Amino acid sequence: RNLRDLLAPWVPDAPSRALREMTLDSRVAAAGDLFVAVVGHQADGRRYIPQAIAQGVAAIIAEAKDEATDGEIREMHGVPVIYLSQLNERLSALAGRFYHEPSDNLRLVGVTGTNGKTTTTQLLAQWSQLLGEISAVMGTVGNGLLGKVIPGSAVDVQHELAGLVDQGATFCAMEVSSHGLVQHRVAALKFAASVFTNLSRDHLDYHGDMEHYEAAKWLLYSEHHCGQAIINADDEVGRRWLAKLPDAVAVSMEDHINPNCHGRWLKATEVNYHDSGATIRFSSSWGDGEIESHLMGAFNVSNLLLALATLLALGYPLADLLKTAARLQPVCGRMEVFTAPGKPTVVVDYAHTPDALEKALQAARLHCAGKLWCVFGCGGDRDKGKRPLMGAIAEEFADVAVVTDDNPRTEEPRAIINDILAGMLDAGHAKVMEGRAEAVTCAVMQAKENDVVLVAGKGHEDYQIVGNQRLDYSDRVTVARLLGVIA
Secondary structure, eight states: OBHHHHHTTTOTTOOOOBOOOEESOTTTOOTTOEEEEOEETTEEGGGGHHHHHHTTOSEEEEEOTTTOOTTOEEEETTEEEEEETTHHHHHHHHHHHHTTOGGGSSEEEEEESSSSHHHHHHHHHHHHHHTTOOEEEEETTEEEETTOOBOOOHHHHHHHHHHHHHTTOSEEEEEOOHHHHHTTTTTTOBOSEEEEOOOOOOSOOSHHHHHHHHHHHHHHHHHSBOOEEEEETTSHHHHHHHHHOTTSEEEESSSOOOGGGOOEEEEEEEEEEETTEEEEEEEETTOOEEEEEOOOSHHHHHHHHHHHHHHHHTTOOHHHHHHHGGGOOOOTTSSEEEOOTTSOEEEEEOOOSHHHHHHHHHHHHHTOSSOEEEEEOOOSSSOOTHHHHHHHHHHHHOSEEEEOOSOOBTSOHHHHHHHHHHTOSOGGGSEEOSSHHHHHHHHHHHSOTTOEEEEESOTTOOEEEETTEEEEOOHHHHHHHHHTOOO
16 A cells, blocks of 8 residues: 555655555554545544644645645655545545455445345345355444444445455445435445335425435435446335436336336235245246245335345346245344244344334234234333333234333333333233243243234343343243244
């Protein structure tokens, strides 16, 4: 890594200097580093140039605004200070070059939208790895090779992607946030494909507002290297964009493919939501098929179809994708199904808010031939407002509500339960059982073979906080043991 080579596309005359790491933070800026001095929200990195120099940085690239002309090379205490205009906009490119263009050395797929990013990225990484990639994810759960995802500027993004390339990754599925996009955090990444799940963007009822939002997003899209575009046609905004993008792939499970456009498409023609997943029949411009998914609910059918369409668009053979679909797993503790011969289906989900609980129950209901049970509680020593709302939801969307404890902390457990029951029309119809393990057991043991039990609020978490004690407890393990299976 050399300053002169780093800057060659933009500044021809730049001095030769060996460089170690690239950093925006003067505090960690060490001997031989490149310090990048940016102007951001209420902070100006240029003010920390002396500190960085004093700490022995090899070189500095700095925002030119109000200080210098674009490409101006200065020297301070023998340290080159090179000024660039619109440095925030160019930081991704600068870091990309610094880290040897990681997105040109693996197949990077970006997933954007309000919901389903995490699941879709996981599915992309898993499925590609099933077909022989070494896959990785970058998202809200963390970054890493599949199964080793460890829990954020344009520099950090490039650095992390380079780390993955160094570890052998040949495929990366990345969550891209609206905020990340707008702040130029992925500006220079070469996406092989870009996936759009959905837009629950409230506050856009005014046509001028929807117009400006769309305009701003279109402008950003046009500036990025998005590669193959894969768009959920079951989303309203999705459809409007598809009408403008004849090379985009349209994905639907609700009959929104327009076959007159002769574009690429994939659509679920029928779905059987059953006691251990979903049987998905689909047609596509690549051929037709049937997938056995072990994911639960309609949203996860959508997520799966988006991943499928993406991998098809990138040239992964349909026959191979079909052969590996049954190996795709849920995100741990997210609508995670547990089944055993002749027992109720049990779903463990992290849902711990009214909206999440409603969604989880509606999803579970699809797979439920019999009665739907909901085992849940609310956290103690936290905002109490959600409690009656979760009670009303459980009463409405489940057939049996089993109210129990969920991290009661130092609050009287029964008081929490009372707040929950208060939200019900008929609290007397709810079951209450304290000891969470006992409540889960009660549902699982009483539920009929064709019933579904949703165990909500913990997901992957393996603790129950009672008092100041973090007790070893897992819904997944409890359910697994009851069903005679392995979590």
